[model samples]
Target: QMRLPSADVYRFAEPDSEENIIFEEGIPIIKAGTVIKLIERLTYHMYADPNFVRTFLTTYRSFCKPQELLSLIIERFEIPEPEPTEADRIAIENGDQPLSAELKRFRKEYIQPVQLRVLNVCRHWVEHHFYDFERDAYLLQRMEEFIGTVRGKAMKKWVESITKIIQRKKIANITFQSSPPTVEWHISRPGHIETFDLLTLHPIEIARQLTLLESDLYRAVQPSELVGSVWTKEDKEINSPNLLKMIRHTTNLTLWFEKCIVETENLEERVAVVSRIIEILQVFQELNNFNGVLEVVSAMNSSPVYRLDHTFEQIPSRQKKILEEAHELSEDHYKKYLAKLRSINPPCVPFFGIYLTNILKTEEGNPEVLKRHGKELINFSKRRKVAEITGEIQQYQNQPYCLRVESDIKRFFENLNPMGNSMEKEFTDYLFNKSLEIEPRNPKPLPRFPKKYSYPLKSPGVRPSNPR
Candidate 1:
């Protein structure tokens, strides 16, 4: 049997040739690349071609699906291949690659879809329940199952609409811990409700209409996350991100429940249903189910019961705990509580906080002495150069007697310097306020040296006697 020679490059190996095969070693690899070379190579062909799209859809469908091929093609044509836009990165920041097929699809299929479907189903059950509690329970169970499986463009769009709703209302509800808090709208419609029923009612329908395409109809708007600080008094005060999420989710739920009342036939059952919703909200209230609570409140207002009493002077202690857990510090406290925590979690001296506080204090003439060190602290941060941070501390060698900066020893994190200019800013912020505990000083740099170009003193460390 004749074996075919292997050649992974442009040149193919033929057994008939006497020359040895020149194989490409360290073979061209693109790590973490969303577009595989094979797929990229195929991109040259028109995705609009039904045959091509049908064929390509088989493998890439996990990222989207066969029905969405046209949309992807349209996206590819109108937008860049990465879609939306490329993320911006700075020299001294931590970064990660774009969302993967798995993450994108999982979010589309599971997270967004679940919420949208739940809202749709809630709309339906509210409108169509046939005086049967068992049926309503079945619908609720079905809604949960639907939410667990849907994701992607649908999810993104839904989230976007929700964001828009908040923005339009001039509400500053949601926040994120990510560098830039990603904000988005969540939207639902009459059509989406129908789709929800179709998906929730029968397994056969889902399998059959699996290829049906959805339109980008839900209205949306999402504000970008704040750049640097993700946590703030806002995050802590309104119970931060948790409470915000509840507000948004509850708004959607309320819309859905109201739709149910408008469509349903049973008035007596509707009254009981409304009471059940209130009961459910009360339970959620106990659990700090902000989403459920919001929905109930909104629904009650829209119905004969217009607005809930805000004057429940004393909420149960359990609700207070839930509310507290919605915020960052309180949530952290709750975690510690659950695991048998100490009185304090231990705190790191916040360098930035201290500096800012000191500056403020000095401005107010409270510390008085800080007025002297004011400029000194600023110099270490703003005035210090990358050459100074990456290189050695300015010092004078005591033996030979010469003052100079340390040699460019090529620090271990050498490649990070984009231009290889032998200079990079310090990333010491992580070691201070952000860290939970005191960080150790760098292995080197001891014996504080004077800031000035100190009279060409021989060796900054030890003051050697002048050369005879």
Candidate 2:
């Protein structure tokens, strides 16, 4: 398949021909484009060409450096002054009328637009990907030098916007480290809650602390991961990165409780475990942490835990009342969930699955590109909605939890020192078989064509097992 970045270039492949040349220039058209050609191609366009702009900056690092880009854009902005023609030179010497110098029309069309578009490209690059500037001081210095040299009055708005970001990023925390802290498993429990018991801890603190962890995890999600339906992919970590870690984390919370609920051998103790989990959900609702609510709620509703009629039946009356409320929030088609998400204020952790599904539906309904007249448009309208969705996600990421990080409590939760790691597929796999053991249901009469057992409890894993 071929894409047309600009309308001027549209050429089809010739099957008999040696090469499948594309776009205007030649056979080796755009792949690893020379630095000048990429930026130069963008300079003369009717409007800012987003496909080219985002594409070049995002992938350009592979073939070019920030230094080369700054210098190239700098020189390209200073298009050489036009030379005087023989007629114009004679006219000037003879004091005859020369209607318009090449300089005048040249300034309006070629010169002014290129300079602003260069600033446009610069504005976008700096505003969106200032980490490049933050990565090196000398790189920022070159930008300072270039923005200082820009001459036009009309350039002020773009230049000012770019400078504001530059100043903010320059003054911003240079040593800020938001990476997930390294966690090591405990050989033995030493905390005050010696059994790693949820019942022993204050439900408020449990909700508060998990809110902190879930919020930070959600905040860590980069916009790139939500694009192209990566989180749901078979090879999601590679296809869309950073997102995997966040889900792996939330999925662990669900698995943790599922194991706890199923593993409790005594019916009375198992019901108590289920009650404490539901109480945690009530607190999660109080804190507006739908993220934590779903993880725990999902655990309760998972096939293994759900089938435990004796345990759920034994939950204390008040706890059962609260459980119904949580079940309503995890409503069909997420109707009730999204309404509550819209109603709540900041410092709330909105369930991320709702956002992912919105992106998925939006992307499928919206064309990647649509043909209009002779041009293949990038369909900015579709991307605008995508940005709008992620933009709301960033709103929560900006707000931090006021609660302090308590270390021993953190270790207790993080080092869920148990039968196995929560995210292991064996965990999900083990869960079903573990379910079969707790409440042995009669097998359905054999179907004409048998199918493997599956439930809401599951999705296929990152590295799926081969056919048995």
Candidate 3:
């Protein structure tokens, strides 16, 4: 019943052009200038690619505000009527050879399809991520009114679909709660980051809890955090919480192990700790947790713990072989680690240090926008390699550890207060001094204070969670 009355004639239908494309490192990438350019791509370029639509709608939050997004799409929906031909007028002949059917065809083919695509984009947004709507009442009102304008019977279903979603999500937002599935601690003082000690636990259980924490933190590292290698950035910890926590845990775990050994004045207390740690390291290898092995090994190989000659004399011969083998596997720029990681199946935790270094090396060497053959453009391969390396790390995320999350043990490691960050040199210095205090370097023999470890069970470690 209603149309644009020839005022809305489309001068559009232009396709991809070289002017719109940005070149870098002999490759071309789209450079949308703002919301207007962005919405153009969201509508036109996203035509054949569903994932492009999905990813755009999903991640566009970082690029544009919710209010501006719907505004552009609203303007985009106003497709001008196709330019009227001279057939509508005359050379003095007067016939109403109007563009009514032509308008009809345009409506069905161009206008309606784009309008429907806009419908889907809206549908996808509210249906999946309505929190954006709930938080920003501006967009909520802005969007609700836009949908209202298209409130005809055909769009009624999708319109109605959004209505239901909005109301339901509103109710859910009123009262909500969430939790980790199996791991639990009914702490009296919930504010206390739970304080469960490690030395008393069995080596296998220690490995289980360590794997649980590391795997969880590993899986949660976002793809966005690795975009420009934030791990290498100076203000990295502020933007990258997950990676920060991971690196913190690695360094803290190493320092904690060092503290546990170097500070123990008695020869055999030191021996019990070292023997069990090596036992856990062995379990780490068997469990296919190369990262686990790396952390514990780093503590062992630290100068303070490494120079305890009297402590080494007390360690059993078999434990010495285990330590030597671990050293071999971890050395040589972690080449053996790659071979080991590839040999192992899923549910394995590769060392983050290796991948972090990989990202740094890849990013540092390649300038973001390189000048090549008289053209300066972004280095597209830089991002692809970062993404590629990240992908390799992520492939292991899906398969989970077979061991149950013993909430008690997992909570202990989770709450470990290692030598705090920014105190790396101070902590290392303190440990070295402590090592000398306990047993002066190159000692003939110190007084032997002995005690047998209570929890020393000899059982094989868990098999790879994904068996071939």
Candidate 4:
């Protein structure tokens, strides 16, 4: 007998906007300055596409490549080559960090069996530099006093490490006869400061220009709550500037990492720089949402496995469901993304782990199941047609075939593969038992797991006694 309020009048029809976005009692509203600053930076970067305009195309391409090979390099800078010789096999099994002893042993054993090719495209960028000027000539000379620092024995050892990474596990049947030499070189002049300075000061590089009025705007962002409306306006302004600053910092750091990778002299130094970049990126939420961050992650000569697991775990459960639905809608596109990623880029492509894990489950199902019953199901009806034409009796070993009959059930789960085969296994198992109960001898396999049995049904507390 109780009556509720009028339903139509109580309904909230208008969508919420900033003005209508009310906070609870005493909950501080986001300052107006904050909103403005966030909007300013987002809009600026979206229109400018700052990342693509600044970085090199080669830098972009290097970030995506074959996963098996690249992933190994990122995880353990050096490893045993595939189908490795006795020395490699032994060293790998023992978890040799340097393989110095192995290398010497190999040289003694084979006298150069395979020539190890080291592509030193990244070699020149890792050295240091100093400068001097000819007083009269007004000329600069850059110096690397440590050029003679690399002794032959040390160089040989480093070469061994590099060779192990490229040739590891004999992935491409690469023969390692002689590994390439690691070169150390230094800068000859100090002209780069001027050149780089000029580049950074370009018109487009100017991130901000504010008059006195704009300066006041920044101050007003965090308005005093005592002053009422001004607080709201000022807070947004403050937030806007802070957000913009963060975005600018992100952009600059991304550029710096790319530059260091291409220009650093030592692989160790380059890797260190890349690691710092990753650490900085982790400080921000939605780091991967920005393509620039994704590109840097894809390019780093390191794998971020633990970090990724942590990140994926943090994703909202609803987001995970939506991602799964997107992938299931189109698997062909998903596979191409996986294979192409492995061939051309880094293995830790963001947003891809979910799809890859699911695909693996699907493709690896059964072997014999598909081979046995797949052809049987397809030929059932065709055999019936042939029998009718020749006046011969047609009979399938598995089950009775029919041309047209109401509710003539056909099984689709006959040949599910090993990967993602769990669903099909449960389905067919249920059908097999059911058919055997109805017909003793010629029971056909079921196609899929019954939905009712897919998830756990009840507590184990009670059992039903059989009642005839």
**lDDT against the true structure, each candidate:** 0.27, 0.65, 0.67, 0.27
Candidate with better lDDT, 2 vs 4? 2
Better-scoring candidate (lDDT), 2 or 3: 3
By lDDT, who's the top model here?
3
Model 2, 244-291: lDDT tens digits are 776777777887788877666555566656776876787788778888
lDDT (Cα) of model 2: 0.65
> Tens-digit lDDT track for model 4 on 1-468?
112123343212123233423222322321211222211221221133222111211111122222221222122212222235576677778887445554554443321211111112111111100011112112111111112222346345545544453333224323433542221111211222322221122111111111111122222221111111221254744424432433333333333444443333233333333343343333211211222333244333222221222233544465445444333423664564344333432212123223223323322332211112222111112222222221211011111111111110101111112223345356335434433332233234322321311222222111112233
- The TM-score values for the models, in the order shown, are 0.18, 0.62, 0.65, 0.15
Best by TM-score: 3
- Against the correct fold, how does model 3 do in TM-score? 0.65
List runs of model 3 lying over 4 Å from the truth: 1-13, 22-47, 50-78, 81-199, 224-238, 309-333, 339-344, 353-402, 418-425, 437-439, 443-468
**Order of candidate numbers by TM-score, starting with the best:** 3, 2, 1, 4
In model 4, how large is the Cα lDDT of residue 145? 15
**Residue range 1-468, candidate 1, lDDT tens digits:** 212123332112223111221112313211111222223322322122222222232223223332343333322222112222233233223466544444454344433433354333223322322112232455334333433333455445544554344234332222333332111111212234322321121222211111010000000100001111222335542223432332343344454454343232233333333433443444443322232343455455552223211111223455334333433222442353323212322210111122223333333332211112222111111111211211111111011101121112111111112212322122222212211121113452222212321122121111122333
Clashes of each: 33, 0, 3, 61
> What's the residue-level lDDT of 111 in candidate 2?
64
lDDT for 58 in candidate 1 is: 23
Q: Rank candidates, lDDT, best first.
A: 3, 2, 1, 4
Worst 10 residues of 3 by lDDT: 180-189
TM-score of decoy 4: 0.15
